[PDB]
Every structure is written in structure tokens, then in C-alpha cells.
């Protein structure tokens with residue numbers, strides 16, 4: 477059972493801007509998603525201070541980067557707080573509405589796409605490099621869900637029947653044909669070193685077999 481939803485007009489407009497604007501500095505997408513992961517890990521770490529049972533679904537707080545040349549996917553996995561169904565459908569998009577509007581107003585004032593994180597909508601920088609983004613997530617208070625969008629103005633949500641995650645978020649980037657450089661180990665290392673050196677959680681770059 478798959479539910480299809482329309483993006484708010486402002487968000488669909490930003491996604492189309494990100495997909496169709498000529499902008500060569502695409503590597504910043506990895507910084508934005510890792511920063512999103514780090515924030516999610518901060519959140520579950522804080523909550524567990526007053527309620528340690530919130531870590532029963534997983535004590536380890538980390539980030540994994542998993543390139544897959546055969547599927548042409550780059551997966552970013554964290555064990556942060558995860559998202560509920562209401563987060564996926566309602567809450568996060570309601571917040572992203574004002575940040576999207578402010579980000580696009582800034583881009584008219586001369587700002588550039590690499591500043592997207594200062595507006596809280598850095599996740600959409602994934603569509604610099606991906607034709608489709610799948611998000612698998614599990615929050616302690618909800619079941620495991622899959623969110624998915626190829627832009628075009630819509631996204632889907634379904635309960636996920638795949639491998640159970642315990643807790644956290646997995647962002648699967650189905651990469652554009654001309655963006656396979658972000659599946660190379662030395663490229664990913666370069667980008668993490670440049671942009672994410674001081675993230676306060678272990679970032680593990682998986683090697684391909």
C-alpha cells in the first residue's frame with residue numbers, strides 16, 4: 477500500500493531549481509546530508525540523557541557511507557533519532573516551507589546554492605547528484621517507513637518491509653548517470669576531509685568488494 481502526496485508548491489519549485497540550474501560545485505550535497513545525520517544523532521543522544529531506554533534500539537551512534545557501483549547508489553546511514561510518519565508527511569515539510577522561500581529569495585539577492593544549509597533545507601541538495609532519493613527511517617515511537625521522490629512534484633510513503641533498522645535514517649541516492657564520481661573511494665574521502673572533518677561521530681566509508 478503506497479500513498480502518493482504532492483509537495484507544497486514552494487518546495488517543488490526549489491527542487492526544480494536544484495535539478496535544472498547549472499552549478500558545478502555539486503560535492504556539497506555530502507556535507508549537507510552528513511550534517512543532517514549529525515543533527516539526528518545529537519537529538520537522540522540528548523534525549524537518552526533523561527531517558528536511557530531510548531537507546532534500547534541501538535547504543536551505537538555513527539554514520540556509514542556505502543557506495544554501490546552495481547546499483548549506482550550512494551547510501552548515507554545514521555543511527556540518529558529517525559523520523560515518524562507524521563514527520564515524513566507533515567512536520568518536516570511544513571518547516572521546510574519557510575526555509576525554501578527564504579533560500580530562493582537569497583538566491584535572487586546573489587547567494588549561491590552552497591549556502592542551502594543556512595536555510596534548513598540542505599536535504600534537497602541531494603537532487604544535485606541523484607535522479608531519485610529513497611529515505612528509510614525508524615523512530616522509537618513508530619514503525620519503519622520508506623519515503624521516495626524523483627521530484628516532479630510528488631513523493632510516496634509506504635511502510636518498509638525490508639531489513640529492520642533498529643533506529644535511524646538511511647538516505648539512498650540513485651545517482652545521475654554523469655555523477656558516478658561520488659562512488660569512488662578517493663573522491664568520497666576527499667569530500668569528507670574537506671567538508672566534514674570535525675563531525676563528532678565516527679564516519680565509516682565502506683569499501684566495495
Ligand SMILES: O=C(c1ccco1)N1CCSCC1
Nearest residue numbers: 563564565568569599611623
Ligand atoms: O522533502 C520532504 C518533504 C516535503 C514535504 C513532505 O516531505 N522530506 C524530505 C525527506 S525526509 C522528510 C520528507
